């Protein structure tokens, strides 16, 4: 009989650190 | 003789979302 | 015999980028 399947791959990595927030209210 | 090698395993979960970016700048 | 088991996944897709981060601070 055939063998049985791999099991799952891992999770894949964390994404990136999102972009820099937008500026601050003006003075 | 043995059977037919397995198949291989699924892919992986798509990993989870980077973190938040960091604080914008000063207005 | 049973086949010998597939190879394990591949590792599932990197995450995507986190969002934008919190605002900054008043000018």
């Given at each position: 009989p055939p063998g049985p399947p791999?099991?799952?791959?891992?999770?894949?990595?964390?994404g990136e650190p999102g972009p820099p927030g937008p500026p601050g209210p003006p003075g």
């Open positions: 791999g099991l799952p791959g891992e999770r894949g990595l964390r």
